[PDB]
Amino acid sequence: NLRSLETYERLEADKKKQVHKKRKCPGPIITYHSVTVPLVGPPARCSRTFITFSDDAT
Amino acid sequence: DVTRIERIGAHSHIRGLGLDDALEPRQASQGMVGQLAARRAAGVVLEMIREGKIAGRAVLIAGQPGTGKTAIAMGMAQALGPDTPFTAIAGSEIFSLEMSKTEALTQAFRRSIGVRIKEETEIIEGEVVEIQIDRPASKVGKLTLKTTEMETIYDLGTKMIESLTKDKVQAGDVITIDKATGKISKLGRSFTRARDYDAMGSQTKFVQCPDGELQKRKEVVHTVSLHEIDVINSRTQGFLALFSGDTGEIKSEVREQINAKVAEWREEGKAEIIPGVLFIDEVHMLDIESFSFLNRALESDMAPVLIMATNRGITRIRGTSYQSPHGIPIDLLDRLLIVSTTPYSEKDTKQILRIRCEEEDVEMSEDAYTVLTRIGLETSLRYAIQLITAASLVCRKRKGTEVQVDDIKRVYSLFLDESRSTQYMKEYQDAFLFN
Ligand SMILES: Nc1ncnc2c1ncn2[C@@H]1O[C@H](COP(=O)(O)OP(=O)(O)O)[C@@H](O)[C@H]1O
Ligand SMILES: [Mg+2]
């Protein structure tokens, strides 16, 4: 019944998973990424950049 | 210490009018000495300016040369502050090859009227904690901002992604995003870039983390003069003419359109009029056409308070053969109030010399003060003022600490005033040209 009821009440999980997808359309993509990372020998932090390529050809 | 653009000028000691709450001038306050009646009148005129309810009030400061007319004008300017516009021109500045005298007087009047615009803006302000941009080789992206109070993850549109890429936004940047137009401004960094990156040779100070909500409704105040509005609206590339001064005679229809929309902006809540002061020093250089324009120009509701100065007595009006008081026609003199300045006494001259020595940082003995006061009374106040500097230099040359009488006598003998130079010119008149 909960699964049946979720046909009406599953407003949250399904919408969140459909909207906040972690992937995009096919093809070559170049991802610029920059995150805070903690410094090593609020806390001491520094900024670091990663560049990610979808395929070896690009 | 360091030599700034602004140095010690002829009125650097003037800080204001030196008045109390009742506009009763002090003997020596804010760099002003004497001129009690003239300074009280200047205070009343300054109150009239600050009230802003009356348009086109003209005041003429008339007095003998060196009696403090420009000093009083500069005191009014200092006590007015930067909020209220105060345009000071020489009367000879209106004679232009780029525009007519009447156009120049209009631009001078319209420069002395501020328009204080207000607008509300949506501003995002926070620390970039993560930024991801993915592009083919449309662009997609995700940006997270923090502000101590909250941390929100944003899904970025293409235009915002383009702006962020152009600004080169990186994690650890304290940025500001104007939601109205997408303009991105960086306030500063919050912590260093990775030490492992070569080059990047900087250790700039890190601004403190923003606080409160990420998005705030911020009210911003922008002030422009009527002349800036006119020049901007005069042509497609008008804004460039605000700096180069290549402004031809702006069409009167554009000025009427601006006056009307400014009136609407002040009937609405969009803008507030800040009427200021136009100071025409040495107004006797204006010709009859300029005075005749000033007559009608002061009758406009957008006219500022016009302050004028001249030392001419009953003299010939330029461009005519008629003589009138102050070199101004009686028709304009009727439209103005005259404030008269009186010659100084020994005490006032000594106090002025003391203030000038203090501003020039010259230590000088009391006997030197007495001899310099006698010289200033005999010759002129400005001559004694310039002897202050010359005697300081002569004293420092001899490795002295306090300017004594010997230095004043030395510089008096070195540098002549108008009278002794004139006597020597007459003694050698045959050597000079055309007798
Ligand atoms: N009441 C005063 N207080 C302080 N300084 C004054 C006063 N009157 C004149 N001075 C100074 O003496 C000089 C006189 O020049 P100025 O004031 O331009 O006279 P004017 O404009 O009447 O020719 C200036 O350096 C001025 O700053
Ligand atoms: Mg003067």
Structural domains of chain B, ranges and CATH numbers in brackets: 9-113+225-344 (3.40.50.300), 345-435 (1.10.8.60)
Hey, are the CB atoms on B130 and A32 less than 8 Å from each other?
Answer: no
Looking at beta carbons, which residues of chain A come within 8 Å of B133? 31-33
Distance B68 CA to ligand 2 centre (A): 7
CA atoms within 13 A on the CB side of B364: 32
* A24 to chain B: closest CA residue: B140
Question: CB under 8 Å, gap of 24 or more: what pairs does B227-231 form?
Answer: B227/B107, B227/B110, B227/B111, B229/B115, B229/B258, B229/B262, B230/B107, B230/B110, B230/B254, B230/B255, B230/B258
Hey, are the CB atoms on A45 and B132 less than 8 Å from each other?
Answer: no
Hey, are the CB atoms on B192 and A47 less than 8 Å from each other?
Answer: yes
Exposed, middle or buried, B330 (CB in 10 Å: 0-12/13-18/19+)?
exposed
- Which residue's structure tokens are 């400061």? B61
Resolution (A): 3.4
User: Does B10 sit in the ligand 1 pocket, CB within 6 Å?
Assistant: yes
Distance of alpha carbon B331 from alpha carbon B62, whole angstroms? 17
Q: Is B69 annotated as a binding residue?
A: yes
* A32 to chain B: closest CA residue: B133
Distance of alpha carbon B163 from alpha carbon B154, whole angstroms? 15
Distance of alpha carbon A2 from alpha carbon B197, whole angstroms? 55
Residue B395: C-alpha distances to residues B202, B258, B390 (Å): 47, 59, 9
**What's the per-residue H, E or C state across B275-319?**
ECEEEEECHHHCEHHHHHHHHHHCCCCCCCEEEEEECCCEEECEC
Alpha-carbon gap: B178 to the closest alpha carbon of chain A (Å): 22
Per-residue tokens: B353: 């010399």
- Which residue's structure tokens are 């020595």? B357
Distance of alpha carbon B20 from alpha carbon B22, whole angstroms? 5
Q: Computed from CA positions of residues B87, B92, B98, B99, in that sequence, does the dihedral angle turn out positive or negative? A: positive
What type of residue is B169? V
Beta-carbon contacts of residue B52 (< 8 Å; ≥ 6 apart): B273, B274, B275
Q: Whose CA is nearest to atom 20 of ligand 1?
A: B66
Q: Is B70 annotated as a binding residue?
A: yes
User: Does B297 sit in the ligand 1 pocket, CB within 6 Å?
Assistant: no
Looking at beta carbons, which residues of chain B come within 8 Å of A33? 130-133
Instruction: Please identify every residue whose CB atom is under 5 Å from ligand 2, which is an ion.
Output: B 70
User: Does B339 sit in the ligand 1 pocket, CB within 6 Å?
Assistant: no
Beta pairing class for B140-146 and B151-155: antiparallel
Question: CB under 8 Å, gap of 24 or more: what pairs does B18-26 form?
Answer: B18/B75, B19/B43, B19/B79, B23/B47
Method of elucidation:
cryo-EM
* B139 to chain A: closest CA residue: A29
User: Does B67 sit in the ligand 1 pocket, CB within 6 Å?
Assistant: yes
Distance of alpha carbon B328 from alpha carbon B298, whole angstroms? 15
